């Protein structure tokens, strides 16, 4: 059947799409289409990674401000490098480090 | 023997590449035993 | 207008005919059976109710026995 005029605007079948599989290309889904692989994906993924790192920075700031350690660690913990609220480590015997 | 020759028709299941290989199931067990034997000798 | 009532027989050879039908009569459980199963399952569902009733009865009976004995000890003495 003669493809409708709008069919030119729609994308083709992707490389990952099995050749036999037929899907309607007009349907829109937020998660993406049947096999995706859009052009410009590399840039979108780089932007995503940047937004992920920025949000990780914000989350790290928030956590550090809200992370309350009320009991001294038994030994040195990595948090000391970045957070200054760690109580001085005391060992099992009781000696301060 | 009356009936379909089921075993002759399916005689391809003994293909060299369709048999069990000890190496696939246990890839480095021999190496591990050799290393243990060496360690044993050293420690003893 | 209405959808066609004609079936598709393209895949009948591959996946079997539709001649065989269900044997269910599409009717529900008998009234006698339902009464038994409702009056069996619902008490099981209300297990806390029976535990509370049991404990409360035991408590009230103990308290009443205590009062009775108290009365007896407070009469002679």
């Amino acid at each position: 059947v003669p493809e409708p005029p709008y069919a030119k605007y729609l994308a083709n079948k992707s490389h990952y799409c099995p050749p036999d599989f037929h899907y309607s290309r007009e349907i829109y889904a937020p998660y993406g289409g049947y096999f995706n692989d859009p052009k410009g994906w590399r840039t979108n993924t780089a932007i995503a990674t940047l937004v992920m790192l920025a949000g990780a920075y914000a989350v790290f700031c928030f956590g550090n401000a809200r992370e309350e350690r009320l009991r001294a660690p038994k030994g040195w913990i990595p948090s000391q490098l970045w957070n200054d609220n760690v109580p001085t480590p005391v060992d099992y015997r009781g000696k301060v480090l | 023997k009356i009936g379909f020759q089921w075993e002759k028709y399916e005689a391809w299941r003994y293909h060299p590449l369709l048999r069990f290989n000890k190496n696939t199931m246990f890839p480095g067990v021999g190496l591990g035993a050799a290393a243990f034997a060496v360690y044993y000798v050293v420690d003893t | 207008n209405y959808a066609s009532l004609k079936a598709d027989t393209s895949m009948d050879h591959v996946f079997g005919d539709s001649t065989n039908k269900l044997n269910y009569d599409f009717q529900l459980m008998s009234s006698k059976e339902a009464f038994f199963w409702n009056y069996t399952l619902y008490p099981i569902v209300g297990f806390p109710i029976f535990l509370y009733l049991y404990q409360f009865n035991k408590l009230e009976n103990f308290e009443a026995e205590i009062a009775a004995a108290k009365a007896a000890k407070a009469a002679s003495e």
Binding site: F21, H22, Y23, S24 | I2, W6, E10, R13 | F15
Partner: protein, 120 residues
Amino acid sequence: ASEAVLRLPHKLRVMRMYRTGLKEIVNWSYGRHEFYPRANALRMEFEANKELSDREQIRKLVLHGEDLLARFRHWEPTIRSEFVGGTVYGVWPQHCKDVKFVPNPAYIDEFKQGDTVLLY
């Protein structure tokens, strides 16, 4: 035995009994190696009574074999994945064409879209 099996003629009934018994041999086996002796045993079992002509004895044999094949139905039939009763049957069914898509839906009489109260 089901009604469809019962309506079948004698020859088709015995062919069906052999087929079903072979499938049940496959279902109850642990490997292809087990199948061959069991299938030969089933063949010999049917061949032994094939020349019987007494209708009453034949009926008894058929009925008993049907009761045996009913009791020994497997909980898990061994069915190919792509066929009905298979894991991959219907996973991503092939879409048929001629799908009715309405283009620019919100732009068809945009101002007057809504429900009206008609009165007499």
